[PDB]
Ligand binder design. Structure first.
Ligand SMILES: *C(=O)[C@@H](NC(C)=O)[C@@H]1NC(C(=O)O)=C(C)CS1
Length: 407
């Protein structure tokens, strides 16, 4: 039996079964592309990805699986990650379709054995979906959305944003102790003030922060047809005030029975950006576009499915505005690309090294794409790199999407 193929939405075959003049052997053209997603199926080396999760379909002549992944956007994501540990998701904000999904370091089917026998390093980890990180200031997107949706603040409400501040028996600091004095929220957000945003976190309370995070998908195993490990938040009744403050800045510091939080996946970060870009409506991401019978009939198709409306459309619009300012004039100016209006939120989070995040969307006025990035600084300094990569990848992916839409 000839096992079914795995194919991108734009028609590039990534897994196929080739008849020998003698039986069938599994072939991965573009071996190395989208490995964590395609996966594999070996007696010796085990089982992963779509080869595993769609096995009954690929097996039974098998039917073929067409992914949502766009081979061109995927290649772009992959090139952006040459030389780093980290990952990138690109997603259609109105459907939850995953147009690219890249983790680094990665691997080819040809190296698998050697990778596994050696058992050293982390190439098999999918940092889009199976690695949990402190989102840092990227999470303030949520804090802001919730503050606005609950009518606790506005973008023009003023906050004192000093270098340092005492909250709930402990201190909160802006990066490098910068005292920005009294500024409006839109600006504190854009400049990514921890002391400003902490106060809004406190104004919200734990129940609000946690419940809005859950509404964007925390606690849910995101993916209709792929595995994401859930993003974590604490039991709100267990959180201290101080912990609430830092949590709202994207820093998990709780000492309690329930998990510290937030801890996010990059996938979870995309879903937040998507929902904000999609008028507050949260979409459960997916990666299988359709299934082809052995004779090519399109036998099923995955439908987009909402996980709820996390904030009002009004709130979503205010959050988009605030994210525009991040990129036009704030921490995320390295995401700027000439000719396209890009909005987003940056993040940086901590033995000496740290990680750089970015979530964004474009075009500002009628978003059709979303990006989520983490670049792990593994001793190296990668401040502002999340934003660099994100912008660049978004713009490239937009060009590809726009050619595809008119073709
Ligand atoms: C949250 O990520 C904050 N970082 C630290 C070290 O506290 C803010 N991060 C950012 C950012 O947007 O990445 C900057 C540059 C200011 S501090």
């Amino acid at each position: 039996v000839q096992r079914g193929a795995i194919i991108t939405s734009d028609g590039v075959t990534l897994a196929e079964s080739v008849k020998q003049d003698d039986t069938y052997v599994r072939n991965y053209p573009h071996d190395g592309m989208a490995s964590h997603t395609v996966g594999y199926i070996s007696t010796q080396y085990g089982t992963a990805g779509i080869e595993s999760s769609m096995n009954e379909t690929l097996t039974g002549t098998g039917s073929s699986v067409v992914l949502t992944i766009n081979s061109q956007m995927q290649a772009v994501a992959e090139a952006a990650l040459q030389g780093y540990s980290g990952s990138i998701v690109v997603m259609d904000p109105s459907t939850g379709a995953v147009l690219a999904k890249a983790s680094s370091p990665s691997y080819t089917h040809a190296e698998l054995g050697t990778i596994i026998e050696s058992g050293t390093g982390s190439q098999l980890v999918d940092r889009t979906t199976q690695a949990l990180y402190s989102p840092g200031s990227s999470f303030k997107t949520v804090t802001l959305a919730a503050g606005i949706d609950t009518h606790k603040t506005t973008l023009d409400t003023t906050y004192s944003a000093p270098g340092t501040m005492e909250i709930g028996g402990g201190t909160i600091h802006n990066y490098a102790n910068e005292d920005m004095g009294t500024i409006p929220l839109r600006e504190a957000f854009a400049r990514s003030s921890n002391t400003a945003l902490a106060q809004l976190g406190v104004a919200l309370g734990a129940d609000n922060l946690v419940s809005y995070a859950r509404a964007f998908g925390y606690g849910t195993a995101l993916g209709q047809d792929f595995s994401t490990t859930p993003s974590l938040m604490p039991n709100p009744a267990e959180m201290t005030t101080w912990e609430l403050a830092w949590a709202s800045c994207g820093l998990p510091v709780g000492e309690h029975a329930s998990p510290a939080g937030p801890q996010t996946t990059v996938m979870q970060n995309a879903v937040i950006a998507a929902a904000i870009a999609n008028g507050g409506v949260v979409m459960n991401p997916y990666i299988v576009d359709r299934v082809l019978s052995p004779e090519g009939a399109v036998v099923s198709t995955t439908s987009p499915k909402s996980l709820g409306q996390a904030v009002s459309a009004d709130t979503a619009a205010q959050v988009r505005e605030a994210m525009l300012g991040v990129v036009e004039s704030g921490t995320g100016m390295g995401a700027r690309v000439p000719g396209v209006k890009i909005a987003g939120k940056t993040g940086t989070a901590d033995n000496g090294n740290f990680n750089s995040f970015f979530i964004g969307f474009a075009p500002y006025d009628h978003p059709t794409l979303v990006v989520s990035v983490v670049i792990e600084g593994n001793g190296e300094n990668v401040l502002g790199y999340g934003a660099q990569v994100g912008g660049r990848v978004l713009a490239q992916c937009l060009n590809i999407q726009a050619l595809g839409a008119a073709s």
